[PDB]
Amino acid sequence: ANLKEIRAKVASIKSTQKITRAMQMVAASKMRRAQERMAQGRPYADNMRRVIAHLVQANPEYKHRYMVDRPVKRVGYIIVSSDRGLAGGLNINLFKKVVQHVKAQQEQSIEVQFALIGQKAVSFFKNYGGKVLGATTQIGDAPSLEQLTGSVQVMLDAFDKGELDRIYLVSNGFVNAMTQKPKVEQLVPLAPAEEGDDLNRTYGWDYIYEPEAEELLNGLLVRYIESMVYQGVIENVACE
Amino acid sequence: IKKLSGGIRTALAQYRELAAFAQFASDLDEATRKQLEHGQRVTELMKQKQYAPYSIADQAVSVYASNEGYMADVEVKKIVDFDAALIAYFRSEYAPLMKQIDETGDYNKDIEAAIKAGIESFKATQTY
Amino acid sequence: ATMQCDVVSVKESIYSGAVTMLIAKGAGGELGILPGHAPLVTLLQPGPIRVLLENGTEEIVYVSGGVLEVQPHVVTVLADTAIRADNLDEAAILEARKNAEQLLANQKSDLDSAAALAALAETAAQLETIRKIKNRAQ
Amino acid sequence: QLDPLVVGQEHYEIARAVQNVLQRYKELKDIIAILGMDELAEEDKLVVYRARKIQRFFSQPFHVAEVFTGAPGKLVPLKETIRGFKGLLAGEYDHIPEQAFYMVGGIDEVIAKAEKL
Amino acid sequence: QLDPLVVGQEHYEIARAVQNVLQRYKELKDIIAILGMDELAEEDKLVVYRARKIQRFFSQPFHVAEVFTGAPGKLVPLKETIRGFKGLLAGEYDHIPEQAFYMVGGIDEVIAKAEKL
């Protein structure tokens, strides 16, 4: 029978369930706190989009590479995930979808290059092998601008040499407080999206630039894509 | 005793409800943190030695001091020493009030004002 | 007249107020701001930004590089890293935030491990020796 | 009779492997139940699927049970049983759904039922 | 018999503090096995050395036994043990190597060992 140990085991299970629900409250509090950073990433992108829209409208003579498309033979991927486990089926379903995507790409006789963020992702990607271009770990609650330069830097310096053509991103879609849908969108082959603005309200004047506009423009694109990576990372943290 | 027991009752209840939150103490909200601190302080206040038959005067003084947050600043480790020193100082200095309380057990505005004034005095004159 | 001075960074916008005088240090060097100026964009050297309000009160913010944008109706300066430049250096201030982040990460990892890995395994350790003996009569 | 001197080496190894897999799945059941299934190791997922298919494959329609179910009975020689279990433990049928292993005869009937599905 | 009135207040304080330090040593092993000492820097390591010497200090050679010692007396009074534990808790012997605490009776003996090595 061992009845005494039955009451002891019941008490232990009750205590562990209580601490489990307490950890649930802590996770909810962290989720809310992270959700509070959902709004501040957009104004930077808005201003950057406005200024480059004016820049291309005023000087529509040089078609730069970062918003043009050429025949595709190589692509790049970016993965952001968790540093530990017990985060639900988020990372594993995300990786199932991305492996389906790359398998679909494989039939076109094109391979992939990628560098990721997360211990689980490096572990599971090394458990099956592939081509990696960097690694990161131990980011925690607060990612920084400096902590997330390596991945975007390697993507940029790989694309600028013509090795790569298009770069996607892989994250989780925080549809609302308790939903999730994975997403995949391009970053580097910047396609014209919502570019009809600033046309009807065009300005007959133009800004003056002490240097040539090229360095300013490509610095602006760099600003845009670091905002992309920052927004994706914080959105994934909030969803996770 | 009847009019002062409710504070310790609710304090112990709220401390027992959230006893599992005493392992983080890092990012919990302000109300929960204050409740945890007060629960720890009151549960350390109930510490009692042996062969120390407290009367009702010192019990009332200690309970009233704990109720109004007049012992919050005291470190949890030295709560027993602070309580004992406060009781001893009150016994040495404020004897007539103790005799009146022990004899009748009545409550009044005057008694509460005198007890609070004595606690405010002890906050500075005597060091534990 | 004054002019709303919007400062924005990738992480956060720390100041946005109406100011009158803005002295900036671009690629050429130091250059001030007056109303009605021709709009322009200019790379800013890794130094601080100095402004004086209408009453003369000064606001000092650090920028470690960025492109300027000033025009008579709107003023906005974008910075990769920016914070109030009470000194010529900010490492001694940012190290406190670094310590806070590292400590929070370490404590969170410890809490997660202790709460989950030990407790759930301990609960799941022994359950079948009782289920297998439910119908026993001894 | 279950010793290698009486029934041969292959039979003994097949039986021992089957029993080991079943025991491992029975061990994993509790942590699968109270917690999720994602946190398991990949080998544990393979063990779970193989064990479920194994306990599916041990069912058989009888001749004297035709009144209860209405299906004709089947008789299986032990050579086909050993073949099927060795193939199952090897991993050749890791893509077959576990519904195709229910109330059949040999592994050929399993293949036919899976294809018809 | 650990009443502070009869055993002595210092005895009570030292015993309780030593037991709590040993408990702190006991809890650290699981966290070390999970994460390591990356978290534990400037904290919980001092407890590690202190409880290491505390555990080694309980060792004592035995008079009747002759296989591992030459019948040493080692019948030190209580006062020696309490004084040594108080000194070790305070931290004067914190810098002393932990491996000099094995098979030692008194503080003078471990001091002689430490100056010997």
XYZ file of C-alpha atoms in Angstrom:
740
model
C 0.000 0.000 0.000
C 2.544 2.586 1.217
C -0.264 5.041 1.989
C 1.990 7.518 3.813
C 4.081 7.942 0.682
C 0.837 8.430 -1.273
C -0.126 11.466 0.814
C 3.469 12.706 0.572
C 3.433 12.313 -3.225
C 0.071 14.085 -3.471
C 1.440 16.991 -1.429
C 4.542 17.152 -3.635
C 2.429 17.171 -6.809
C 0.228 19.933 -5.386
C 3.254 22.068 -4.493
C 4.827 21.570 -7.921
C 1.548 22.481 -9.625
C 1.356 25.626 -7.481
C 4.882 26.666 -8.464
C 3.975 25.757 -12.058
C 1.043 28.182 -12.045
C 3.249 30.799 -10.360
C 5.754 30.391 -13.195
C 2.806 30.837 -15.560
C 2.030 34.192 -13.922
C 5.703 35.187 -14.175
C 5.732 34.258 -17.868
C 2.557 36.290 -18.424
C 4.154 39.304 -16.729
C 7.258 38.982 -18.910
C 5.017 38.625 -21.971
C 3.198 41.857 -21.113
C 6.462 43.695 -20.420
C 7.912 42.591 -23.766
C 4.629 43.454 -25.505
C 5.086 47.002 -24.221
C 7.969 47.374 -26.726
C 5.679 46.703 -29.708
C 5.259 50.327 -30.789
C 8.618 52.120 -30.684
C 10.193 50.315 -33.655
C 7.848 51.753 -36.296
C 8.557 55.543 -36.361
C 12.200 54.972 -37.346
C 11.094 52.816 -40.272
C 8.492 55.431 -41.219
C 11.011 58.283 -41.384
C 13.593 56.126 -43.168
C 11.030 55.033 -45.770
C 9.890 58.625 -46.304
C 13.402 59.977 -46.810
C 14.489 57.234 -49.212
C 11.206 57.520 -51.109
C 11.979 61.195 -51.661
C 15.584 60.328 -52.534
C 14.590 57.891 -55.288
C 11.785 60.169 -56.516
C 14.107 63.173 -56.875
C 16.923 61.182 -58.536
C 15.349 58.299 -60.503
C 18.494 57.778 -62.580
C 20.599 55.155 -60.770
C 18.791 51.854 -60.196
C 20.609 50.512 -57.153
C 20.947 46.795 -56.488
C 19.187 46.670 -53.113
C 15.751 47.342 -54.663
C 16.245 45.503 -57.961
C 15.912 41.823 -58.849
C 18.185 39.653 -61.000
C 18.079 35.962 -61.983
C 18.153 33.887 -58.810
C 20.690 31.139 -58.121
C 21.499 31.553 -54.403
C 19.544 32.774 -51.373
C 20.131 33.492 -47.706
C 18.199 32.681 -44.554
C 18.069 34.125 -41.035
C 16.692 32.154 -38.079
C 15.874 33.557 -34.631
C 14.835 31.203 -31.832
C 15.062 30.589 -28.084
C 18.161 30.029 -25.959
C 16.528 27.196 -23.970
C 13.573 24.824 -24.161
C 10.053 24.422 -22.767
C 8.868 27.214 -25.090
C 6.069 25.063 -26.495
C 6.029 23.795 -30.053
C 7.023 27.205 -31.385
C 10.599 26.578 -32.530
C 9.999 23.027 -33.765
C 6.970 23.934 -35.890
C 8.861 26.969 -37.187
C 11.737 24.716 -38.212
C 9.373 22.183 -39.789
C 7.922 24.957 -41.944
C 11.334 26.340 -42.891
C 12.696 22.885 -43.761
C 9.628 22.340 -45.955
C 10.391 25.676 -47.629
C 14.040 24.839 -48.318
C 13.063 21.355 -49.510
C 10.709 23.022 -51.990
C 13.572 25.300 -53.054
C 15.849 22.266 -53.485
C 13.951 20.997 -56.542
C 15.016 24.199 -58.337
C 18.705 23.178 -58.006
C 19.571 26.040 -55.645
C 21.297 25.693 -52.275
C 21.061 27.966 -49.237
C 23.328 29.848 -46.837
C 22.260 30.904 -43.363
C 23.331 32.091 -39.931
C 20.979 31.845 -36.971
C 20.291 33.126 -33.456
C 19.658 30.550 -30.733
C 21.081 27.501 -28.951
C 18.257 25.179 -30.011
C 18.639 26.178 -33.658
C 22.399 25.533 -33.816
C 21.887 22.253 -31.953
C 19.204 20.933 -34.295
C 20.923 22.289 -37.422
C 24.180 20.569 -36.452
C 22.210 17.395 -35.714
C 21.378 17.290 -39.446
C 24.168 19.409 -40.956
C 24.320 22.265 -43.415
C 26.193 25.453 -44.260
C 26.358 28.070 -41.496
C 27.793 31.593 -41.618
C 27.790 32.595 -37.945
C 26.412 31.910 -34.498
C 25.098 33.756 -31.448
C 23.782 32.847 -28.009
C 22.701 34.219 -24.620
C 20.720 37.257 -25.746
C 18.096 37.186 -22.995
C 15.201 39.556 -22.430
C 16.838 42.632 -23.954
C 18.531 42.416 -27.365
C 20.707 45.344 -28.375
C 21.650 47.024 -31.629
C 25.254 45.879 -31.145
C 24.371 42.334 -30.041
C 22.667 41.627 -33.399
C 25.100 42.984 -35.993
C 26.967 39.796 -36.899
C 24.121 38.049 -38.714
C 23.011 41.096 -40.692
C 26.652 42.019 -41.365
C 27.475 38.593 -42.801
C 24.286 38.612 -44.889
C 25.157 42.062 -46.236
C 28.813 41.322 -46.994
C 27.809 38.048 -48.656
C 25.159 39.703 -50.838
C 27.365 42.652 -51.833
C 29.875 40.281 -53.467
C 27.209 38.698 -55.689
C 27.310 35.345 -53.886
C 23.694 35.713 -52.711
C 20.590 37.103 -54.400
C 17.633 37.156 -51.981
C 17.503 36.943 -48.182
C 14.423 35.949 -46.177
C 13.683 35.937 -42.455
C 12.129 33.312 -40.192
C 10.157 34.294 -37.087
C 6.841 33.729 -35.295
C 3.750 35.852 -35.846
C 2.337 37.352 -32.642
C -1.147 37.717 -34.105
C -2.562 38.783 -30.746
C -2.075 37.963 -27.029
C -2.468 34.191 -27.461
C -2.140 33.351 -31.178
C 0.810 32.439 -33.385
C 1.340 31.995 -37.134
C 4.833 31.608 -38.638
C 5.893 34.041 -41.345
C 8.502 34.273 -44.113
C 9.374 37.516 -45.918
C 12.295 38.820 -47.963
C 14.653 41.498 -46.651
C 17.477 42.303 -49.075
C 15.634 42.254 -52.453
C 13.587 45.259 -51.327
C 10.476 45.204 -53.485
C 8.329 48.303 -54.080
C 5.621 48.102 -51.406
C 3.196 50.954 -50.666
C 5.328 53.242 -52.840
C 2.359 55.243 -54.143
C 2.726 57.787 -51.337
C 4.697 61.045 -51.621
C 3.746 61.079 -55.318
C 0.543 63.141 -55.223
C 2.115 65.266 -52.455
C 5.469 65.576 -54.230
C 7.660 68.565 -53.371
C 9.085 70.768 -56.107
C 12.233 71.355 -54.052
C 15.124 69.039 -53.169
C 17.508 68.696 -50.255
C 21.168 69.629 -50.694
C 23.938 67.136 -49.919
C 27.566 68.018 -49.253
C 28.753 64.494 -50.291
C 27.485 62.356 -53.152
C 24.097 60.830 -52.361
C 25.344 57.230 -52.663
C 26.872 56.866 -49.197
C 23.816 58.443 -47.576
C 21.427 56.231 -49.518
C 23.128 52.925 -48.779
C 23.575 53.939 -45.148
C 19.815 54.486 -45.124
C 19.225 50.976 -46.483
C 21.539 49.611 -43.782
C 19.456 51.471 -41.212
C 16.301 49.949 -42.682
C 17.504 46.368 -42.540
C 18.826 46.621 -38.997
C 15.375 47.920 -38.066
C 13.927 44.844 -39.799
C 16.126 42.483 -37.794
C 15.448 44.330 -34.521
C 11.682 44.301 -35.081
C 11.725 40.615 -35.971
C 13.761 39.702 -32.892
C 11.561 41.619 -30.452
C 8.387 40.300 -32.095
C 9.681 36.748 -31.712
C 10.540 37.389 -28.055
C 7.025 38.707 -27.428
C 5.442 35.728 -29.196
C 7.663 33.158 -27.457
C -6.985 41.862 21.305
C -10.239 41.440 19.381
C -9.854 44.802 17.644
C -6.193 44.207 16.702
C -6.068 40.508 15.715
C -7.573 41.125 12.267
C -4.452 42.757 10.859
C -2.226 39.807 11.697
C -4.937 37.444 10.427
C -5.112 39.063 6.991
C -1.319 39.453 6.844
C -0.766 35.746 7.492
C -3.502 34.856 4.995
C -1.977 36.927 2.189
C 1.498 35.611 3.035
C 0.341 31.984 2.932
C -1.498 32.523 -0.361
C 1.667 33.544 -2.263
C 4.301 31.514 -0.393
C 5.700 30.232 -3.712
C 6.851 33.700 -4.858
C 9.743 33.857 -2.357
C 12.249 32.422 -4.860
C 12.546 35.240 -7.435
C 12.360 38.639 -5.656
C 13.568 40.198 -8.924
C 10.746 41.454 -11.180
C 7.557 40.879 -9.163
C 5.116 43.778 -9.004
C 5.257 46.343 -6.210
C 2.130 45.135 -4.397
C 3.228 41.488 -4.406
C 6.734 42.450 -3.257
C 5.367 44.536 -0.378
C 2.992 41.729 0.605
C 5.874 39.237 0.617
C 8.029 41.541 2.754
C 5.214 42.147 5.244
C 4.422 38.432 5.416
C 8.058 37.573 6.091
C 8.261 40.254 8.787
C 5.064 39.130 10.527
C 6.003 35.439 10.334
C 9.327 36.328 11.951
C 7.460 38.411 14.543
C 5.541 35.343 15.755
C 8.859 33.859 16.916
C 8.636 33.200 20.651
C 11.174 31.943 23.176
C 10.465 29.459 25.979
C 9.334 30.383 29.494
C 8.488 33.925 28.346
C 4.824 34.360 29.325
C 3.947 37.598 27.531
C 1.196 39.642 29.153
C -1.392 41.496 27.068
C 0.300 44.924 27.167
C 3.468 43.898 25.319
C 1.414 41.749 22.935
C -0.790 44.730 22.079
C 2.190 47.072 21.693
C 4.043 44.689 19.374
C 0.940 43.915 17.301
C 0.107 47.612 16.911
C 3.699 48.412 15.931
C 3.651 45.656 13.304
C 0.219 46.680 11.995
C 1.128 50.274 11.088
C 4.437 49.435 9.410
C 6.554 50.895 12.214
C 8.849 47.832 12.091
C 9.296 47.672 8.300
C 12.765 49.247 8.396
C 13.990 46.612 10.865
C 16.066 43.877 9.255
C 14.319 40.498 9.290
C 17.302 38.908 11.052
C 17.113 41.324 14.012
C 13.302 41.432 14.290
C 13.352 39.426 17.534
C 15.992 41.698 19.070
C 14.104 44.830 18.007
C 10.827 43.527 19.447
C 12.416 42.482 22.746
C 14.284 45.784 23.119
C 11.149 47.800 22.339
C 9.111 45.817 24.872
C 11.813 46.228 27.526
C 12.091 49.978 26.920
C 8.312 50.395 27.102
C 8.228 48.405 30.348
C 11.033 50.497 31.842
C 9.681 53.916 30.827
C 5.900 53.689 30.246
C 4.930 51.527 33.246
C 1.610 53.242 34.214
C 0.136 52.633 30.757
C 1.124 48.965 31.004
C -0.505 48.672 34.428
C -3.695 50.302 33.131
C -3.799 48.034 30.070
C -3.140 44.869 32.087
C -5.735 45.771 34.723
C -8.680 46.572 32.431
C -7.787 45.852 28.806
C -9.888 48.791 27.629
C -9.257 50.709 24.413
C -9.538 54.440 23.779
C -8.204 57.244 21.623
C -5.934 58.231 24.519
C -4.430 54.738 24.809
C -3.742 54.515 21.072
C -2.245 58.015 20.994
C 0.005 57.268 23.975
C 1.173 53.967 22.469
C 1.920 55.595 19.105
C 3.765 58.476 20.786
C 5.847 56.022 22.801
C 6.688 54.051 19.661
C 7.735 57.257 17.894
C 9.893 58.093 20.917
C 11.525 54.643 20.958
C 12.266 55.058 17.242
C 15.138 57.377 18.246
C 16.014 57.310 21.955
C 16.702 53.569 22.313
C 18.857 51.525 19.926
C 18.544 47.751 19.597
C 9.940 81.304 -32.866
C 10.939 77.788 -31.778
C 11.229 74.484 -33.633
C 10.321 71.002 -32.369
C 13.587 69.049 -32.055
C 12.827 65.350 -32.532
C 15.654 62.992 -31.568
C 15.107 59.340 -32.469
C 17.151 56.187 -32.012
C 16.633 52.597 -33.117
C 15.664 51.536 -29.586
C 13.786 54.630 -28.397
C 13.209 58.345 -28.902
C 14.576 60.040 -25.803
C 13.760 63.710 -26.458
C 11.183 65.598 -28.501
C 10.695 69.262 -27.626
C 10.480 72.706 -29.169
C 13.943 74.301 -29.312
C 15.318 77.411 -31.016
C 19.074 76.916 -31.497
C 20.891 73.796 -32.689
C 24.675 73.636 -33.108
C 25.776 70.512 -34.986
C 29.146 69.054 -36.004
C 28.902 67.522 -39.473
C 31.461 66.050 -41.840
C 32.794 69.511 -42.637
C 32.618 70.414 -38.963
C 30.620 72.618 -36.629
C 27.495 74.208 -38.122
C 24.531 75.929 -36.475
C 20.795 76.006 -37.164
C 18.598 79.045 -37.826
C 14.984 79.235 -39.035
C 14.437 79.319 -42.778
C 17.584 77.313 -43.522
C 17.795 75.292 -46.721
C 17.009 71.627 -45.949
C 19.901 69.179 -46.058
C 21.086 65.781 -44.852
C 24.524 65.462 -43.284
C 26.513 62.707 -41.598
C 27.238 63.627 -37.976
C 30.605 62.902 -36.391
C 30.650 60.697 -33.261
C 30.247 63.524 -30.772
C 27.587 65.179 -28.627
C 24.743 67.449 -29.771
C 24.316 70.894 -28.202
C 21.100 72.937 -28.283
C 19.834 76.030 -26.482
C 16.108 76.523 -25.951
C 14.195 79.792 -26.277
C 14.949 80.628 -22.635
C 18.556 79.480 -23.147
C 18.369 76.119 -21.365
C 20.793 73.591 -22.849
C 20.095 69.933 -23.650
C 23.045 67.615 -24.319
C 22.647 64.233 -26.044
C 25.343 61.916 -27.382
C 25.246 60.506 -30.912
C 27.821 57.976 -32.140
C 27.243 58.743 -35.803
C 24.143 59.506 -37.837
C 22.664 61.501 -40.692
C 21.158 64.943 -40.079
C 17.854 66.257 -41.427
C 16.775 69.836 -40.683
C 14.199 71.977 -42.477
C 12.218 75.063 -41.412
C 9.033 73.166 -40.520
C 10.285 69.831 -39.096
C 13.490 68.783 -37.338
C 14.529 65.149 -36.932
C 17.921 63.575 -36.220
C 18.352 59.797 -36.406
C 21.045 58.031 -34.372
C 22.129 54.402 -34.153
C 23.199 54.819 -30.511
C 22.125 57.881 -28.541
C 21.903 58.938 -24.896
C 22.148 62.147 -22.880
C 25.819 63.160 -22.952
C 26.438 64.339 -19.404
C 30.074 63.408 -20.140
C 32.299 62.780 -23.150
C 31.931 59.040 -22.419
C 28.954 56.789 -21.671
C 30.570 53.386 -21.036
C 30.482 53.911 -17.260
C 26.701 54.425 -17.524
C 25.982 51.663 -20.037
C 27.912 49.138 -17.924
C 25.208 49.375 -15.252
C 22.578 48.371 -17.816
C 24.879 45.583 -19.011
C 25.199 44.285 -15.444
C 21.429 44.464 -14.960
C 20.778 42.549 -18.190
C 23.385 39.879 -17.445
C 22.076 39.419 -13.900
C 18.463 39.187 -15.062
C 19.398 36.616 -17.712
C 21.367 34.494 -15.235
C 18.633 34.621 -12.585
C 15.962 33.810 -15.180
C 17.915 30.777 -16.396
C 18.408 29.606 -12.804
C 14.716 30.067 -11.989
C 13.575 28.223 -15.117
C 15.943 25.305 -14.516
C 15.135 24.937 -10.813
C 11.377 25.336 -11.274
C 11.016 22.917 -14.196
C 13.764 20.334 -14.607
C 14.071 19.110 -11.020
C 10.433 19.490 -9.968
C 8.660 17.842 -12.908
C 11.111 14.924 -12.952
C 10.722 14.481 -9.189
C 6.934 14.367 -9.548
C 7.145 11.908 -12.459
C 9.761 9.769 -10.672
C 7.511 7.167 -9.017
C 3.845 6.609 -9.922
C 3.430 3.051 -11.278
C 4.279 1.019 -8.159
C 0.999 2.340 -6.728
C -1.150 1.977 -9.846
C -0.072 -1.659 -10.232
C -1.333 -2.515 -6.722
C -4.809 -0.930 -6.758
C -6.708 -4.246 -6.727
C -4.471 -5.891 -4.105
C -6.169 -7.390 -1.053
C -2.996 -8.431 0.838
C 11.101 -22.887 -24.838
C 12.375 -19.309 -25.317
C 16.124 -19.907 -25.251
C 18.575 -19.769 -28.177
C 19.389 -23.494 -27.976
C 15.799 -24.536 -28.781
C 14.346 -21.943 -31.184
C 17.528 -20.571 -32.761
C 19.367 -17.273 -32.612
C 17.160 -15.136 -34.870
C 13.886 -15.907 -33.077
C 15.457 -15.118 -29.697
C 16.929 -11.808 -30.869
C 13.622 -10.737 -32.436
C 11.670 -11.509 -29.262
C 14.199 -9.748 -27.027
C 14.247 -6.618 -29.198
C 10.438 -6.457 -29.285
C 10.189 -6.774 -25.504
C 12.891 -4.131 -25.001
C 11.082 -1.631 -27.242
C 7.779 -2.233 -25.454
C 9.410 -1.776 -22.040
C 11.039 1.490 -23.129
C 7.721 2.872 -24.389
C 5.992 1.885 -21.145
C 8.749 3.746 -19.296
C 8.350 6.891 -21.412
C 4.540 6.964 -21.070
C 4.417 9.034 -17.867
C 6.660 11.897 -19.001
C 4.840 11.855 -22.338
C 1.524 12.209 -20.506
C 2.083 14.845 -17.822
C 4.435 16.971 -19.925
C 4.275 17.446 -23.688
C 5.799 15.386 -26.472
C 8.008 18.018 -28.137
C 10.690 17.984 -25.421
C 11.427 14.288 -26.022
C 14.562 13.126 -27.783
C 14.163 12.031 -31.395
C 15.041 8.437 -30.498
C 12.195 8.518 -27.970
C 9.736 9.636 -30.662
C 10.928 6.816 -32.919
C 10.538 4.364 -30.027
C 6.995 5.593 -29.348
C 5.918 5.228 -32.977
C 7.556 1.809 -33.343
C 5.990 0.528 -30.117
C 2.523 1.725 -31.124
C 2.879 0.005 -34.499
C 4.160 -3.127 -32.738
C 1.144 -3.378 -30.450
C -1.086 -2.744 -33.469
C 0.560 -5.609 -35.374
C -0.174 -8.186 -32.635
C -3.914 -8.220 -33.407
C -5.366 -10.989 -35.557
C -8.868 -11.986 -36.738
C -9.890 -15.464 -35.597
C -11.990 -18.104 -37.334
C -14.299 -18.638 -34.338
C -14.828 -14.873 -33.917
C -16.510 -14.415 -37.308
C -19.913 -14.048 -35.634
C -18.804 -11.060 -33.549
C -17.097 -9.010 -36.280
C -18.154 -10.532 -39.608
C -14.598 -10.797 -40.951
C -13.006 -14.079 -42.076
C -10.276 -15.629 -39.979
C -6.582 -15.692 -40.821
C -3.762 -18.146 -40.131
C -0.152 -16.943 -40.125
C 2.942 -19.176 -40.297
C 5.670 -18.073 -37.915
C 8.185 -17.415 -40.710
C 6.061 -14.518 -41.974
C 5.721 -13.255 -38.395
C 9.502 -13.241 -37.930
C 9.964 -11.551 -41.317
C 7.442 -8.832 -40.507
C 8.770 -8.130 -37.022
C 12.381 -8.014 -38.230
C 11.353 -5.577 -40.959
C 9.426 -3.473 -38.445
C 12.355 -3.269 -36.025
C 14.805 -2.547 -38.859
C 12.861 0.568 -39.859
C 11.685 -0.277 -43.366
C 8.041 0.608 -42.607
C 8.553 3.976 -40.902
C 6.271 5.729 -43.420
C 3.274 3.379 -43.112
C 0.406 4.793 -41.016
C -0.311 2.923 -37.801
C -3.918 2.299 -38.895
C -2.772 -0.226 -41.523
C -1.420 -2.633 -38.872
C -4.829 -3.331 -37.289
C -6.545 -6.710 -37.799
C -4.500 -8.109 -40.682
C -2.472 -11.229 -41.391
C 1.040 -10.886 -42.771
C 3.013 -7.791 -43.687
C 1.783 -8.093 -47.286
C -1.764 -7.423 -46.090
C -0.378 -4.419 -44.201
C 1.167 -3.091 -47.418
C -2.051 -3.661 -49.371
C -4.227 -2.000 -46.718
C -1.871 0.980 -46.489
C -1.831 1.422 -50.272
C -5.629 1.176 -50.462
C -5.933 3.877 -47.775
C 20.146 18.420 23.773
C 20.866 21.424 21.519
C 19.035 23.843 23.822
C 21.119 27.067 23.856
C 20.572 27.417 27.614
C 22.309 24.141 28.500
C 24.688 23.545 25.574
C 25.810 27.185 25.458
C 24.682 30.062 23.250
C 27.927 30.012 21.255
C 27.528 26.254 20.759
C 23.993 26.768 19.433
C 24.989 29.590 17.082
C 28.014 27.737 15.697
C 26.117 24.474 15.190
C 23.196 26.147 13.414
C 25.476 28.258 11.211
C 27.622 25.254 10.245
C 24.529 23.203 9.399
C 23.115 26.037 7.277
C 26.438 26.440 5.445
C 26.491 22.699 4.744
C 22.924 22.949 3.440
C 24.069 25.734 1.112
C 26.804 23.395 -0.133
C 24.230 20.633 -0.636
C 21.952 22.768 -2.818
C 24.725 24.073 -5.086
C 25.584 20.688 -6.627
C 22.412 20.442 -8.726
C 22.834 23.967 -10.104
C 26.503 23.219 -10.815
C 25.519 20.062 -12.704
C 22.879 21.952 -14.695
C 24.623 25.259 -15.494
C 28.027 25.326 -13.805
C 29.857 28.158 -12.031
C 29.119 30.775 -14.718
C 26.419 32.273 -12.493
C 28.278 31.606 -9.238
C 31.030 34.229 -9.266
C 31.896 36.018 -5.992
C 28.839 34.253 -4.505
C 28.312 30.679 -3.267
C 31.938 29.804 -4.023
C 33.173 30.962 -0.614
C 30.534 28.627 0.803
C 31.952 25.909 -1.457
C 35.447 26.096 0.029
C 34.139 26.652 3.568
C 31.888 23.596 3.484
C 34.675 21.616 1.805
C 36.902 22.167 4.833
C 33.875 21.671 7.109
C 33.209 18.237 5.600
C 36.890 17.313 5.796
C 37.047 18.496 9.427
C 34.658 15.794 10.679
C 37.349 13.205 9.915
C 39.059 11.771 12.983
C 41.608 8.980 13.505
C 40.476 6.289 15.909
C 42.407 4.954 18.895
C 41.518 1.242 18.824
C 41.967 1.013 15.060
C 45.624 0.455 14.176
C 45.364 -0.219 10.428
C 45.197 3.452 9.389
C 46.762 5.230 12.406
C 49.044 4.426 15.320
C 46.397 4.642 18.070
C 46.292 8.459 18.334
C 44.651 10.052 21.341
C 42.692 12.835 19.609
C 40.412 13.031 22.681
C 40.198 16.810 22.457
C 37.783 18.622 24.800
C 34.611 20.221 23.499
C 36.122 23.706 23.812
C 38.718 22.903 21.144
C 36.029 21.782 18.686
C 33.802 24.812 19.307
C 36.764 27.199 19.033
C 37.915 25.594 15.788
C 34.464 25.674 14.213
C 34.017 29.311 15.269
C 37.374 30.239 13.753
C 36.637 28.381 10.520
C 33.234 30.065 10.216
C 34.744 33.495 10.912
C 37.243 33.138 8.054
C 40.765 33.057 9.545
C 41.233 29.550 8.103
C 39.426 30.367 4.841
C 42.727 30.767 2.972
C 44.128 27.549 4.491
C 44.075 24.679 1.952
C 41.059 22.407 2.309
C 43.078 19.185 1.967
C 44.975 19.806 5.220
C 41.739 19.174 7.154
C 41.824 15.381 6.670
C 42.606 13.219 9.720
C 43.134 16.128 12.118
C 42.129 16.439 15.760
C 42.728 20.058 16.744
C 43.291 23.471 15.195
C 46.959 23.462 16.205
C 47.448 20.179 14.334
C 45.864 21.481 11.122
C 47.895 24.695 11.459
C 51.067 22.607 11.760
C 49.997 20.625 8.696
C 49.289 23.801 6.712
C 52.680 25.297 7.538
C 54.237 21.914 6.710
C 52.843 21.783 3.162
